[PDB]
Amino acid sequence: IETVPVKLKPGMDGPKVKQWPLTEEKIKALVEICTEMEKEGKISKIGPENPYNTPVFAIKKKDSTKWRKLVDFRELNKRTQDFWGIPHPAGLKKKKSVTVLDVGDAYFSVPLDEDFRKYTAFTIPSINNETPGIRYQYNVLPQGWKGSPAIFQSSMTKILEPFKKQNPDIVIYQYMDDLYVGSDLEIGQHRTKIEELRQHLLRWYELHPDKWTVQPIVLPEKDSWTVNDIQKLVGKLNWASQIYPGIKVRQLSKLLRGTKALTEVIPLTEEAELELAENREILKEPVHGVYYDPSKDLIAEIQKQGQGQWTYQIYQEPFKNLKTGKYARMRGAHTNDVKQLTEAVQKITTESIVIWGKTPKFKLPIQKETWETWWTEYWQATWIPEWEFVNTPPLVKLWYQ
Amino acid sequence: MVPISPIETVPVKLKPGMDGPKVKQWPLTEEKIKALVEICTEMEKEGKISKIGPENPYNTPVFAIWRKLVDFRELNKRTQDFWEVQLGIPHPAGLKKKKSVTVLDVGDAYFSVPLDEDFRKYTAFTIPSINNETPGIRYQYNVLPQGWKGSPAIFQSSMTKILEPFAAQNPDIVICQYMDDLYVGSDLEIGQHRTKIEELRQHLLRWGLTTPDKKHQKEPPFLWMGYELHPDKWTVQPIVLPEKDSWTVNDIQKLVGKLNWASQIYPGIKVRQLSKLLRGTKALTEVIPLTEEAELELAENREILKEPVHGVYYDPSKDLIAEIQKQGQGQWTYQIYQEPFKNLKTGKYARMRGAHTNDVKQLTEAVQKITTESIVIWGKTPKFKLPIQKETWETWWTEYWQATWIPEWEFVNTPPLVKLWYQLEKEPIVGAETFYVDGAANRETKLGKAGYVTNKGRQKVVPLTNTTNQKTELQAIYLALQDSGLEVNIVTDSQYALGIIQAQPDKSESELVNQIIEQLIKKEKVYLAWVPAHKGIGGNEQVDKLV
Ligand SMILES: C=CC(=O)Nc1cc(Oc2ccccc2OCCn2ccc(=O)[nH]c2=O)c(C)c2cc(C#N)ccc12
């Protein structure tokens, strides 16, 4: 009920980002939602003296037919001054279960600094540019802005103080509009505890990180090897020598001496079996000298494997993976590659938020025009990461399969 | 006097750290000075401007051409940025047919909306004196000046705020605003429509805004932004392709302007060759001879632009369809319609700048473009008619290393059909010969070698001049494709070649790649395997080509 002064970074103007075109039903949904928010004082119409703009669109989250308003505050977030910090809970990922809650409504009860409101301007577009766009600016803390959790941190501490004092074994983390609650209870006890916390927050998404581990490089176990099998094995081992030092392939390449048919079976020599066994032992160990640096960006690479299977690696330095994974979940996206990719990006970003408390920069195996045309149709999260586009097919794809 | 409602001013500032303009007034002739004195006297009598004392340090030049012309370029450089709402014009194909339609130009548009009083001092201008023997007459603007940076945005927002309640309480009509003209449409009877137009003129009069007392001088067809708007249809203003003995660069740019503009309603307009003649010219007066491809293309453009073709208006109750045809050389053409033979609009898509490509990627890109354009114009994605079999698309997207998606579509059998020209095997082929290929070149003399050794003892090495490593790796693969049967396994260490072939092109800039493609099309089964180089893998003979 008392506004805290908020400014931008020195030398940076407000965001001026073009609003992209929206379908008619999304425009209508935003008209109704923004009308209600205006009746509630959360937003106010603005005149042409406000040159700033931030894109807006509408989504439909899980298990709900009601539309939701999503603002792409990426530019404003990177242009907003750095708020300060709380060390990331390194035990949130260790906990057995974590539940994600949307505490976005709580932000709308705290007013926003006056002189800063003009930087949160957004535009409801019109079809065919017939009528001018409906321009609004926020009067309260907006959902999606990085300053909203930083400002509300004190109030959130006061609200969560009794529950924290009651259960010292429950870990609580906050990122943007989401609250991550980790524990080790039973699924039923966890659900009843989550209802207890949501009614505790009312009067004022099952995740299981324990069922997630890092993935090793595995080699085939065969009784008869063809020329092709040994060639692929030598390729994968040669690629893995960039990650593990002692990888040695000369005794296996010695088997490929001569111009033999690809499907011809080759028996392994004793030196080749010993070499392959030593390589297995090397691959069973973790990578040498792999650390996290909070001052560096996280990079996430995704490969499409086919049959709804996807692989990903989060790292900071090449060949120094901090996390690897294989998302193969099938949820109403059997016939749509882009929807699968979008859900995969959301899951990887969620895991990244749980582990390090920030979002990675993605390298997407998709053309820019396709992704930018369709990704908002399948987005259900309140945050948005950064992404770039991979146009050359990477050779290492099958080495993650 | 009936009280006129006040129009709320828009608070305006200058750019941060900057100051108002201070420009020396130009010396004017006695005639121009007298004319400007008369005009500014009348405007001061009307209230648009006001005389100011010597305290105002700012000044903006003034001219007479009589008509007064104030040059606000410096103040425009120094004025803050505004939210310009005119970005992209309404496309006629997006309009919805109405029984009765009226156009109302507003009189004294900018001059009927007041200016922020704290900002008026920056609009100061002086009228020179006769023989400059007295201090010039100092004025400042009290309303939105013509040519000032903020006039269109402030005027449009004010007009919107004024029109909001009338549009709210008259849902049976549609109102749109554009510059100094309003478009009002309705499906009511002509009497009810003219009545509601009178109600709108009264509503605008309540804020002191003037509408045509006479009948509106603009009646259908309306000529607007190169468009012809008719009661039941729309088209482009007439496009005439002139006859020229010699075509220069500006004639070719005029021709590609008329063709690019005419392509949005005329189906089949091609501009690849005529725009290709302009590649890397940067000379407006340079005469460029016409290739026979550009002459044939221009002849087909004249055959399409022979008789007028019109587009219909949008009917939201009918489905939206978009049909695509391949035209060749990376050209694609499309029609968006709701009924057969009656197009809403048309257009084209040219492939991007690339070294390798295939038809499926280009069709995908064109689909994305049409989707975005349709969402802009009509607020929905159309159903597509595409010249590609369902089986072809399924094989492509299921086997493609990138993620890809086309919205709801159906196959239309209108040749040339987009197809997959070759498909590599997933596993080695039993009974097929295995060609181990390699190539290598010298970086200084540009001499190299490319060849293969196979499991049946077949061998070949060919020496090459003026080549590179990449060229010799491709050439080695090409030799293996030339000398093998219908089924063949090929082993290479070239990450470059595998990077090219795994992108699945059917056309390339490199003639060597295109020859490889032509060979792949003739094969029954091809398995391409990769191994690391210099790792002692027998068969992979780097030494055989480094001699
Ligand atoms: C946002 C774009 C927009 O509104 N543009 C426009 C609309 C318009 O009329 C309408 C006004 C209100 C609702 C729909 C309208 O048109 C529906 C289609 N239509 C168009 C012509 C006609 O005769 N009959 C018919 O049904 C007219 C006369 C326009 C005239 C100029 C000129 N100069 C430029 C733009 C115009």
From Swiss-Prot, chain A:
Record annotation: effect of changing P48G: 74% loss of polymerase activity. 86% loss of RNase H activity
Boundaries of every Reverse transcriptase domain copy: 40-207
Result after altering L283S: 31% loss of polymerase activity. No loss of RNase H activity
Effect of substituting L70V: No loss of polymerase activity. No loss of RNase H activity
Impact noted for substituting L179V: 22% loss of DNA-directed DNA polymerase activity. No loss of RNA-directed DNA polymerase activity
Record-listed Mg(2+) 1 binding positions: D102, D177, D178
Effect of I159D: 16% loss of DNA-directed DNA polymerase activity. 24% loss of RNA-directed DNA polymerase activity
Impact after mutating L237S: 17% loss of polymerase activity. 30% loss of RNase H activity
Residue positions of motif Tryptophan repeat motif: 371-387
Effect recorded for K61R: 10-fold decreased sensitivity to ddATP and ddCTP inhibitors
Reported effect, D177N: Strongly decreased RNA-directed and DNA-directed DNA polymerase activities. No effect on RNase H activity
Essential for RT p66/p51 heterodimerization, annotated site positions: W374, W387
UniProt-reported outcome of changing W371L: No effect on RT p66/p51 heterodimerization
Name of the featured protein: p51 RT
Gene behind the chain: gag-pol
Swiss-Prot record, chain B:
Phylogenetic classification of the source organism: Viruses, Riboviria, Pararnavirae, Artverviricota, Revtraviricetes
Outcome following mutation: I252T: 96% loss of polymerase activity. 45% loss of RNase H activity
All residue ranges annotated as the Reverse transcriptase domain in the record: 46-229
Reported impact of V184I: 25% increase of DNA-directed DNA polymerase activity. No loss of RNA-directed DNA polymerase activity
Effect of L69V: No loss of polymerase activity. No loss of RNase H activity
Effect of substituting V437K: Almost complete loss of virion production
Domain RNase H type-1 span(s) in chain numbering: 429-547
Role: Multifunctional enzyme that converts the viral RNA genome into dsDNA in the cytoplasm, shortly after virus entry into the cell. This enzyme displays a DNA polymerase activity that can copy either DNA or RNA templates, and a ribonuclease H (RNase H) activity that cleaves the RNA strand of RNA-DNA heteroduplexes in a partially processive 3' to 5' endonucleasic mode. Conversion of viral genomic RNA into dsDNA requires many steps. A tRNA(3)-Lys binds to the primer-binding site (PBS) situated at the 5'-end of the viral RNA.
Protein name: Reverse transcriptase/ribonuclease H
Boundaries of the shown chain within the full protein: 600 to 1151 of 1447
Effect seen on changing D105S: 5- to 12-fold decrease in affinity for dTTP substrates. Strongly decreased RNA-directed DNA polymerase activity. Slightly decreased DNA-directed DNA polymerase activity. No effect on RNase H activity
